[PDB]
From Swiss-Prot, chains A, B:
InterPro entries: BioU-like, Glu/Leu/Phe/Val/Trp_DH_C, NAD(P)-bd_dom_sf. It comes from Synechocystis sp. (strain ATCC 27184 / PCC 6803 / Kazusa). This is (S)-8-amino-7-oxononanoate synthase BioU. Belongs to the BioU family. The lineage of its organism: Bacteria, Bacillati, Cyanobacteriota, Cyanophyceae, Synechococcales. It comes from the Bacteria. Pathway: Cofactor biosynthesis; biotin biosynthesis.
Amino acid sequence: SLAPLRVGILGFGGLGQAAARLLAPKQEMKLVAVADRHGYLYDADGIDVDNAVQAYTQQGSVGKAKKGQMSEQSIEDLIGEGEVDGYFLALPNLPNTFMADVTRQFIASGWQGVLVDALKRTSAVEQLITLREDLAQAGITYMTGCGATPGLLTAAAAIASQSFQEIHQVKITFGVGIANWEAYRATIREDIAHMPGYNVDKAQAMTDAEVAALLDQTNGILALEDMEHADDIMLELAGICHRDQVTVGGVVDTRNPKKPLSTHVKITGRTFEGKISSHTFTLGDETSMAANVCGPAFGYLKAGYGLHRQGLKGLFTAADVMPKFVR
Amino acid sequence: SLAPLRVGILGFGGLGQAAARLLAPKQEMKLVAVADRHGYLYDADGIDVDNAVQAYTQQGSVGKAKKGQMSEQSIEDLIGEGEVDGYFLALPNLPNTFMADVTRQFIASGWQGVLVDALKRTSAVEQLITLREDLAQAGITYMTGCGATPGLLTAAAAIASQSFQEIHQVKITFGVGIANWEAYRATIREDIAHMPGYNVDKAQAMTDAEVAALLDQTNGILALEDMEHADDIMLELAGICHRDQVTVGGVVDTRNPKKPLSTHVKITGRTFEGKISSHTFTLGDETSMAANVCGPAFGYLKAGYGLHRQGLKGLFTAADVMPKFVR
């Protein structure tokens, strides 16, 4: 707290804005940097979040905030702009290479430190796997899948697995309750993308009108079974089970701030005594999606910093490392 | 598995014997060494567990097994006897300095590698805290409190805490079901010790007769509220909450292999949005005490080895590091 961690956020939709608010009260982490598609804001003394949020929602970019800069390469520019020990990539992976793309800009930039994401999709994480040496070579400690699921729930499964000689299944069921879908438009467009009638390009092609139409069919409720979800490969890399034994589904209600069911992960395996059994980790209904994503993200940023500081670079997943509570 | 981890177990009561059986099927960990109070057994090709267990139960020490050696300093002797990358200290902490004592023998011995315990009591862990530099100086990576609670459940609370700006309570409630109390006589004597009518010396002073008498009062059922439990200091050192916000109680039924209630930890805190809420991690009724203690212990041994290998020595708790699934 004489030397708080200095962090940035890239992407300033609803999730990135939540991340900024989560950081405000912290003593040992300081938000110094935000970027969005058309602009960036840096302030070594701490970002003024109200000002950034107003600028963004009202004028379309944080580049329009008090000390903001407009730019069509905000990321490139922000990197060079000053001292940041790590960034949270709050960005939707759009186009579906954009995280890796942004990651390559970081690789390319000559910057070193900690990066963290909250990617959801097995295939986006694979794109990051391909870069793991390039990361390590660049001096970057990259923490992937460090949100709710993957992330928190993936780490819980990794811990839970220690009671068992062999794991038979890891089943995640998540609930999301948001007041209206626009509040997390990207997140909702990303869910729709991995819905059986659709895909990523068609999802992004859709208008807000057509989105609202789809949601009307079911009173704003999306029931997603066996989705693509990087929990699977993360638990495989950690040596716990094969990806096929990991299933992820959930319900998102876009017309209610109450969570439509309790988010949980169930871990089933066989003990050395040949008993078959299950542990369950359940999240409280009043922990929002934003809290269960961004809290772990910064706990992993702090952990990643610990690893970076002792010279460990490369790609780490939530299943590999103990996140560290941020105060 | 060309180079499996070579491990030892110290203490061969019911828990240490369970540990040996848990290790049998493993491919990447090999039990090479056991010690008990009056004797030891080493075998670089893998201990014959049936033989060791027979020797112990029937002839009173593993020193009486096929390739066993009797000795009144079995630990001292076993250390020097051959290649072991880490040990699980399955020992009851008796006298209440014995773990530290044994730890000092390891410090003193010139041996380096990984040690792990499953201590329960805040004050035994403090004794190990006092030695953390001596450990690091000796080249030892010591993992403490790496059982069920503390251990598994402590790690789960650490993970769960990431959703919250501030933690209000961590409440652990454990269940234990054993067929008869003698099967884990030390564990049961240790519980009785931290029962309100009693203490450690009186517990150890008691006869098997007087023990059975006490248990008759309640049909073999011990109801333990707000016990001394190192979960508290472990979560404090990890920066998550103050020890006073950690409470541990439970029920042990000494007359039934069925668990009398489902073991769980509840983690209550406030999110950045000022919501108060709780996560719950629950263990399956068919995961026994032995599985929930020894599985995590070796997952921490493996993790500790990872840390040791990259030159990190000293004292680590279950709350600090991600255990690694042992295959």
